[PDB]
Amino acid sequence: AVEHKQLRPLDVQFALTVAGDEHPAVTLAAALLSHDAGEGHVCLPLSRLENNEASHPLLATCVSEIGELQNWEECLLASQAVSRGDEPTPMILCGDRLYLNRMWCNERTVARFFNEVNHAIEVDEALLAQTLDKLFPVSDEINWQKVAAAVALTRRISVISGGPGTGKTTTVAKLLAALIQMADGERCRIRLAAPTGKAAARLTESLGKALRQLPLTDEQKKRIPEDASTLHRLLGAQPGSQRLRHHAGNPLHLDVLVVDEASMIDLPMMSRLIDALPDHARVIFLGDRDQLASVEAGAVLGDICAYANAGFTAERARQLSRLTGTHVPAGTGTEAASLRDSLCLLQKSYRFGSDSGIGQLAAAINRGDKTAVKTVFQQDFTDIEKRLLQSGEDYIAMLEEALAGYGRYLDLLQARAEPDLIIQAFNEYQLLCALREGPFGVAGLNERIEQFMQQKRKIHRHPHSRWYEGRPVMIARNDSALGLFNGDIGIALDRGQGTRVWFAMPDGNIKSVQPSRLPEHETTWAMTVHKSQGSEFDHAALILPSQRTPVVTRELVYTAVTRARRRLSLYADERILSAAIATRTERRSGLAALFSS
Amino acid sequence: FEQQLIEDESLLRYQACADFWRRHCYPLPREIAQVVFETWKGPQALLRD
Amino acid sequence: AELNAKTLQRLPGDNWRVTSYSGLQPTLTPHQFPRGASPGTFLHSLFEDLDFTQPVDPNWVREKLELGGFESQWEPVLTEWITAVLQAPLNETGVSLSQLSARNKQVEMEFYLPISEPLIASQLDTLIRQFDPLSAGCPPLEFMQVRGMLKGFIDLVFRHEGRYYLLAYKSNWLGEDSSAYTQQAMAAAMQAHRYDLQYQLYTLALHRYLRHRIADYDY
Amino acid sequence: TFHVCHSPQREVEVLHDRLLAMLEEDPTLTPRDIIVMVADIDSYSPFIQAVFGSAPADRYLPYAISDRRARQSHPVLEAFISLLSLPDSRFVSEDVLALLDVPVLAARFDITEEGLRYLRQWVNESGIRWGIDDDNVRELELPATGQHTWRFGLTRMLLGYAMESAQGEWQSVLPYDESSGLIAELVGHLASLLMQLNIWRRGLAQERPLEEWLPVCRDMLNAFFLPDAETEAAMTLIEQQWQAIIAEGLGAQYGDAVPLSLLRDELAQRLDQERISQRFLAGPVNICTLMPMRSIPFKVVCLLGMNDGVYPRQLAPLGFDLMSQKPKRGDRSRRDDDRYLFLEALISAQQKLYISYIGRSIQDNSERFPSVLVQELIDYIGQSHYLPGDEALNCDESEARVKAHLTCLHTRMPFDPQNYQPGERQSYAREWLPAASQAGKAHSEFVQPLPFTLPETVPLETLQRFWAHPVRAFFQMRLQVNFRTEDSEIPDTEPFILEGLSRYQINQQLLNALVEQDDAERLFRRFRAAGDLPYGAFGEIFWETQCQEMQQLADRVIACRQPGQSMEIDLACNGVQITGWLPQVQPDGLLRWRPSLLSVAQGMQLWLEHLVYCASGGNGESRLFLRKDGEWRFPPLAAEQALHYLSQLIEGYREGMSAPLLVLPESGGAWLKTCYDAQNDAMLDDDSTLQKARTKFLQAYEGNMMVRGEGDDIWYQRLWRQLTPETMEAIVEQSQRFLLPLFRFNQ
Amino acid sequence: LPASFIWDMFVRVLPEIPKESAFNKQSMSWKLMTLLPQLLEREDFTLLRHYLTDDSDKRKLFQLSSKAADLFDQYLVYRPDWLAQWETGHLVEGLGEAQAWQAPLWKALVEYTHQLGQPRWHRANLYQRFIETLESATTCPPGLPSRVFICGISALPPVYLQALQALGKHIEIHLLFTNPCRYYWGDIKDPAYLAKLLTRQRRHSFEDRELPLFRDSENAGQLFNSDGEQDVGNPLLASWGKLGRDYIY
Amino acid sequence: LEAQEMLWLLQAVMTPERENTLRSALATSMMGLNALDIETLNNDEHAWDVVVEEFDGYRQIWRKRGVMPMLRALMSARNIAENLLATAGGERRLTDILHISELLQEAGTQLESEHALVRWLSQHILEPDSNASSQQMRLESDKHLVQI
């Protein structure tokens, strides 16, 4: 890539320190491996290093041996920096793919966890079918949620892949209800994990509103999962040291563990979660397959759910037909029966169907760009609008449409109403931008919206006060003392006691905090696509820059489309939208080879 | 003609004692460094002496 | 024993301060010049140090750019821009800057103007708006009652054919690159930067200086 | 008036009150006619700005202070001076982190403040002390150890970015498991700095002629610094002074080589040449030194710093100047100039003269003599004037009475009630009026009866954290006040000895390795690869004696060791649920090992574990093995006694949350074991035991000059400042109530 | 400032003068850094040969050159006759021991700045050239002001008074002098100078009445001692105003 | 301990957003609050809001006026000097607080940054070296004391 050519100083210093007095081939290989680890690729194939490098014959003149070191494997194994997995070396070459030692250890840990430990818990199928019939009301046609709950309660380790608006939390509630109703005398210490605190709060309020609806018992209500914890707080991560409380010696005393939003889980956090699990806990992963990649290097959920397109096994199809009592299709061929059995795919979305263009556009994002053009083009399904953004007049038209997007918010702000309706109106319309600075970014769009509200008589702003009435703020760091998490919005207004920021807590209350009490505060008229994950907005509007950037890819537009509930607007060029769909953010990892054997 | 006066010379004295300990006690073998360890634990004990 | 702290009855001093006007408020082109306070002061020092009668030498401009630390490529455009500025006359009769001798010019004249009355902004801005035509818009500035001295540094005062003239320099000009700097844009810049009070105080100081120095003086 | 003060802060504080009194007394007295001239403006203007900025809105008079000009960018010029001393520097880690403290050098290499906060602990924990390269170690005539350098720490951080710490060493360098993700990119910034520190170290070492030093400062400024909005003038001043130095050197046409230290000293002299300000503002009251307005006719003239030694300044001659040997009329001298400035200040005073000096020291109340000029002035006053009280008494006695009447001996502290008496002198400080009136409430006691309801489910970890330290558990859990002390700074040398937390961590890892009969030599190489061990043979001797001590401990530990797993504990005591987990529960009982000394806190922890273990089954002893043959043993008990003692500990826990439970473990256990008799199971009441237990309590509370005592703690100093005998008897009674089954069941 | 006004009069009266002097302090230090190792073989510099040739990384040489440049600048300001005699090559009778290493150093400095392309002119010789071109000139040169006010004692150091007397022949100079006493309280040189001082009197500016300099003119000789010092009755004026004594003298 | 209390107070003034440092600094012996006062300050959100607002005002005074005006306004508004003078044994602690304030003013007048003075105070706490200015003075001179 363009960023891959401009070498970071970390990769150059790594190549000069590790190789040093060795051949320049090892230096170039270490620099390319460090750059691919910085970009997010777990493994480095030797074919790309051999073919797509111009200095590859030149290093062939650098090495001088009896066999002349024509192969890359002999040239790497001749140095003391690369071994086969026996010597304590920084670089590891095992399957004609060079990685680092930490990445190789975490990849082997993930492959061991998803290949060997995932055994089949055999339970009674008749009582499980009775609980699935008494919990799920639909039993006339094929329901993917019932099959997902059956395959999650059957196996120990199960991955549930589904998009937003498909009723995943109701499936988790029915799964936990059937789990407690199956094991009556056995106690179940159910635990819930989340990567972020805001997603943990959403998971707590969603499972609270979902599990209280189902009829339970006095011993069943006592075994309700109380709270969802952060993954750093569940394992006991410290700010200074990386030492965990439950690292290798004492595992977490849990019976079942439901980890929501597995798309934002990187490889070292997944490997640290795997090493903390005991030999009897059953883990249920939640997340979307085509969602955005993790923060750090690694792509666990995508490489797991890549085998979901093949299907289930031949015996597992009859097992699911005996469990659910319906017709379950079978997958052709068998490569890895355990991982293909542990997977599931959710296709029936309940909050939107084929009549709405949002789900059709989300299905056309994973397909070619012409399918998305055809989805936007004919009749627009009264849900998706497309506005071309090239010049300044298109920018003025975008600000004019954003005035109509934030119209109810300004109408409730100017009328001096209660702040709860103001936050409820603000949480319906949202702009999503890619970058941060420049004319196309967070700080550009926020300052332009503030200047436009300074121009037209909608929001009065003092230039030196910095806390005018009506500004939306968001926090960047978590704060358990104040009860606000990262990615939570607050609205600053004057209730009569002074300018205070009101936050809408997930428990149904509103909290008025002093602006001097806020640790972090950034204007959130337009959010980044990475920082808007987990939330849901009724009317979303994507704004993409005209300049080519590696941030705008297929997963970014997929997360921008699925962020909207009903209405979605676009402000981008046609060539940028055509190029972002075809350019998929691939992350090279050894899970494709380890799971194939 | 122009010189800066320092009030505390304990830091430079400790640095010179550490330099002496580095240039003397480090290339010694085990049979000599055992007796050096039996006399003083580190350079701080020698400086205190 | 009982003890009490004294309470101050009268204020220790009135609002007295020595303030100024600012306290009361192709590839090489001059449009592509970096806009800042330091290039403005550098151009002001260049216009102060250069003699108007002597012709501009390019090696002198190169030496001044070496002393200031700017780029060497800007110098042959800078000397021709300086000669184009000096060739253009600035008067109602068409008097250029090359006709001013060394005795006629007075560069960077510093004045201290006394004031004993409390300077009220409301009583002064109405008197300004009564006569100044540029005060149609421009909502009035707010400043405290200043009793004392006003500092000022006039850029140039020069005489010609028995008539005195004042000259000041402004060099920020960040927002204009085309030929749009007409009289309307310059008047809008005067109303925005509020240079009317500065030139009014300059006329008052020059009138007081010519009344004190020259006997039987008419404005 | 002559005013004797005790402190310069007190001197300007009396000066401000006297100037306010002079402003209140004379209504036709403008503040522009008042001038305060200080002899030493460098050591007084902080105090003047302090006591003139601290005035309230009804007491504030305007002030403008003339002093030496501060630097336009104070850390940037010092960072450039330190960069000019680069080959002469030893490259200490604090000297590089102080270079990274400047935001210009941090913003040049894209290092943020959070990145600097990560790099602080990354340098402190990875063993980076001194030395950029190994060639820098060999250049200083030192043996090349290869460890505890910047290259060693850089290789350690890069190996930690590549390899986990559990894998092992690669090139006798243990990896650093902290920097693993993208945050180790900041390590790639730090290694981007030191490489630049390798460039200018080898470049500025060789002597160069004056024509070659021209682009050096410019290349250093565009290499190490980034131009910001604030620090443009600093870099411009650096370039201007450097080009002026080179122009004045080449004007003489110097051909020989000029070293780096001469230009560094000349730039350091031309950056600290900021002259004292002579500006006069007619608005505020002018605070300035003597020279600027020698002849100005001010009404109120104040003279500060008129003590001996400071004024008049005596300047030492050069020693070989011909003007000092033969003086003429027009010869400049500092002494005569100051003695004429004092006369011009006396003449220029129109209405009021206020001379103040330091007459008494604030340290030991020593008498300080004033200047010779002020002494001659008060002598001329006493010999030229007399008071109407004693019209004909004497000549010397009337002189002494006049000099004592004019001398106002002010108080040492501003809260003194002498200053607030009505009469001649009366201060205007309203903030110190109720403090000097002594009509305020005293500091009440910290212990107060607080309402506390004991919850249903109390974990075992909360009880362990309570009985580990009860006052700390009262502070950090009930009222959530945890006194956070700042961490220690990075030491300036490699560790030669093992002491403190590092030795305890080495002993803990060695005891955990020897309890499984692992290879001690592999752990020796692992600890030597991290630099935690001394270099060479001394680290081997330290590892051998620690291996001998840990083998002596392990021969007693694994003599009665059985494989045991962690079990669950669910108890119901007094309607309170206790849920927890006990690790390594063997069928023989409880087995714990720690490389520490015989203490009462570990015995309390083992007793709590034995109570929570015997209450749900588990017939067997509980054993803990410490160093120096220290052993805590508890026999198995029935469920009744275990539940009774657990209810007693639960009552102590719920009592410790309302009021601070004053149960000192160490001192209370020492007092108890001095007073307890294990043979008869009864406490002795004779006076000899009561005199020895007091000695044990004073030995364990306040330790010696080598051992940190129990009283030297931030949690105990908040409650009491001095250990009263009433609180001592209260601690004794609480330790007799609670710590009694510790020594009752000890065997 | 007085040095700035003196240099402005030097520029206005005397043409073809360089804007920066060749005898700058840093310039003289950089010249003496080059000239002092050339003169170590000389017999007169034997005090410096034990000071410099023992151990030197050009640190003692630079500080010695800076101190000698400071002394040469002080001599350029205060003692022009000593440097005028040292340029010829003759010593001054009655000075200290530290003279045999300064006068050949100053002569070598003059020869070095004359051999180089730098101009000859410095402050001391241009001072005498200014006095000579103001004393011999019959016609007043242009570019000079009408009246010059000197407010204060330190507004002119007591070395430019000869140039001030030369400027007073063509420019009216008002020296506002701030003396604490109204009579004469300074020193004296000779009894033949005492009568010359007694002949001078001060007339009033507004009242136009002449007043004598002393309180008693008949006892004016009894006030001054035989050495030339007046016994001032005020002890503070006698002990504090020696600079005022020299200035009024 | 008074230097550590002044360091905690300066860290609470410099960083008033996080409530942990402010709660650790308010419960020191310099403020003089009981456990019931700390409990009611932790329970009542409005009183903690008033405390955070007045500490932000103290930070504004510290950035605009300096160290000694901020410390004087803190000792005048909280009235801790009168409480330390009324408490038996607090006059020595008050003189130590005043001397530490004078040394902090002398060190902050020479330092440009505000966090640099806090780092200087933490370093001088970590460096117990004896200078002529940084020694303990006499607590009182009018009251007669037995001189050891």
From Swiss-Prot, chain A:
Reaction(s) this enzyme catalyzes, per UniProt: Couples ATP hydrolysis with the unwinding of duplex DNA at the replication fork by translocating in the 5'-3' direction. This creates two antiparallel DNA single strands (ssDNA). The leading ssDNA polymer is the template for DNA polymerase III holoenzyme which synthesizes a continuous strand; ATP + H2O = ADP + phosphate + H(+)
Stretches of the chain forming a coiled coil according to its record: none
SMART domains the record matches: AAA (SM00382)
Keyword Zinc found: no
EC number annotated for this UniProt entry: 5.6.2.3
CDD domains: DEXSc_RecD-like, SF1_C_RecD
Signal peptide residue numbers: none
Protein name, UniProt field: RecBCD enzyme subunit RecD
UniProtKB/Swiss-Prot annotation, chain E:
Effect of disrupting the coding gene: Decreased degradation of DNA with free ends that is unable to undergo homologous recombination, which can fortuitously lead to more efficient viral infection. Cells are deficient in DNA recombination repair and have increased sensitivity to UV light. The cultures have many inviable cells. Cells can be transformed with retron Ec48-containing plasmids.
Domain of life: Bacteria
Effect of residue 70 to A: Does not act at Chi
UniProt-reported outcome of changing residue 79 to A: Acts at variant Chi sequences
Annotated consequence of substituting residue 74 to A: Acts at variant Chi sequences
Misc remark: In the RecBCD complex, RecB has a slow 3'-5' helicase, an exonuclease activity and loads RecA onto ssDNA, RecD has a fast 5'-3' helicase activity while RecC stimulates the ATPase and processivity of the RecB helicase and contributes to recognition of the Chi site.
Record remark on domains: The holoenzyme may undergo conformational shifts upon DNA binding: the nuclease domain of RecB may swing away from the DNA exit tunnel in RecC. When Chi DNA binds to the RecC tunnel, the nuclease domain may then swing back to its original position (that seen in crystal structures), allowing it to nick the DNA 3' of the Chi site and then rotate to load RecA. At high Mg(2+) the nuclease domain may swing back more frequently, explaining differences seen in assays performed at high Mg(2+).
Family statement: Belongs to the RecC family.
Binding partners and assembly: Heterotrimer of RecB, RecC and RecD. All subunits contribute to DNA-binding. Interacts with YgbT (Cas1). (Microbial infection) Lambda virus GamS protein interacts with the enzyme without displacing any of the subunits.
Name used for this protein in its record: RecBCD enzyme subunit RecC
Name of the gene: recC
Curated annotation (Swiss-Prot), chain F:
Role of this protein: A helicase/nuclease that prepares dsDNA breaks (DSB) for recombinational DNA repair. Binds to DSBs and unwinds DNA via a rapid (>1 kb/second) and highly processive (>30 kb) ATP-dependent bidirectional helicase. Unwinds dsDNA until it encounters a Chi (crossover hotspot instigator, 5'-GCTGGTGG-3') sequence from the 3' direction. Cuts ssDNA a few nucleotides 3' to Chi site, by nicking one strand or switching the strand degraded (depending on the reaction conditions). The properties and activities of the enzyme are changed at Chi.
Organism: Escherichia coli (strain K12)
Deleted gene: phenotype: Decreased degradation of DNA with free ends that is unable to undergo homologous recombination, which can fortuitously lead to more efficient viral infection. Cells are deficient in DNA recombination repair and have increased sensitivity to UV light. The cultures have many inviable cells. Cells cannot be transformed with retron Ec48-containing plasmids.
Official protein name in the record: RecBCD enzyme subunit RecB
Lineage: Bacteria, Pseudomonadati, Pseudomonadota, Gammaproteobacteria, Enterobacterales
Protein family per UniProt: Belongs to the helicase family. UvrD subfamily.
Other comment: In the RecBCD complex, RecB has a slow 3'-5' helicase, an exonuclease activity and loads RecA onto ssDNA, RecD has a fast 5'-3' helicase activity while RecC stimulates the ATPase and processivity of the RecB helicase and contributes to recognition of the Chi site.
Source taxon at top rank: Bacteria
Quaternary structure and partners: Heterotrimer of RecB, RecC and RecD. All subunits contribute to DNA-binding. The C-terminus interacts with RecA. Interacts with YgbT (Cas1).
